[PDB]
Amino acid sequence: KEDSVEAVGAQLKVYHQQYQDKSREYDQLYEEYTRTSQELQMKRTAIEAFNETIKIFEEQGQTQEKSSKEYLERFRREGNEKEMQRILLNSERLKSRIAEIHESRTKLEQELRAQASDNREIDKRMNSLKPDLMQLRKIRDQYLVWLTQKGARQKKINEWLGI
Amino acid sequence: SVPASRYLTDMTLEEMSRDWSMLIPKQKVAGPLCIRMDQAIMDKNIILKANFSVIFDRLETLILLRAFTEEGAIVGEISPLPSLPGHTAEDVKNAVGVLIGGLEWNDNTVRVSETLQRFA
To answer: Residues of crosslink Glycyl lysine isopeptide (Lys-Gly) (interchain with G-Cter in ISG15) (chain B)?
Structure first.
């Protein structure tokens, strides 16, 4: 019968469109994934630059209080309160400045981690599409083979596929 | 790690759907499968390519297997019979042996795909 053949052909058409659609959905995700993945790479790199500056500053604060303890042994005997209250004030200049760049590193890192976490979600969404993609492709291929086996030529197959 | 579900496709849609003819038809029903080979092909190198699924690490279902010459021509096929309910992995392994044998009788050198080596 030429009716069972057109019915399968129509059903092939349905599965192929579904597969083209899931497949486009999949690749959209893949492209958003690879993109934010580069952005993450640029953030990590900027964080690395934050890290080395912060390093410098930390090993300078520890260098300006490693001598400011021994030089509260010449300035122990005083005790000025317009001059003695002033020599730990540049210790406060240095602390407020490590703190400030810490605040800035931590806001970058907070943004990076949230972004990384968003891309893991995209990866899950893709990974979730696979079983339907696989099933659909296979089933679309079985319809195609059944039509070949019943005498359909490539040109007719191609018309049902819409290609 | 191991999915324990995949659909392996050696062939493009174009290969699966291409029109082909046997100069000297040889055809045999192998359970639920159909095996086809051109009795006129001789002294060629042939590659068996297939589309099929796996579960576990094992072949589950054949969708289609076609035999290609080095020049890309189709000279044999294994396929499910459209009438009928399906087949097992074993029908599949037997149909392949039967086809390789048929092509070797005529002095063809027969290779199978890597996906086939691996699961089938």
So the answer is: 26, 28, 44
